[PDB]
Amino acid sequence: NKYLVEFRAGKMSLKGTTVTPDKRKGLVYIQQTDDSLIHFCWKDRTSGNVEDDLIIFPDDCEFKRVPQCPSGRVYVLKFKAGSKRLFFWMQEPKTDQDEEHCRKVNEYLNNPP
């Protein structure tokens, strides 16, 4: 029940080919259960409740940056087998740890303990 990763990030909405950020800034964190199943959860900072919780298996998805609108920190989660795409934006004021979260997320989604 340990959290592999955790950082402030909000979700976005993709309609057709346009991605709009959601003001419901949350927290993107990863937790591995005793079942060795990595739990990808997104909790809204508004209430601090876990709004999203999806188990992600190795090579199931890929966490990468979104070089479409350079200005801040935007990442997209693509399910290699889920054929699903999610968009998130980091609420961290400094990117000194942006790469760490990015690297850890991938390492926890494709390289679990």
Binding site: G10, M12, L14, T17, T18, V19, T20, P21, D22, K23, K25, V66, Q68, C69, S71, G72, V74, V76, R85, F87, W89, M90, Q91, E92, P93
Partner: peptide, 14 residues
């Protein structure tokens, strides 16, 4: 204290 959220943009699966 906290950074403002990004802005709307076009996304293409390249």
């Amino acid at each position: 204290q906290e950074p403002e959220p990004p802005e709307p943009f076009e996304y293409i699966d390249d």
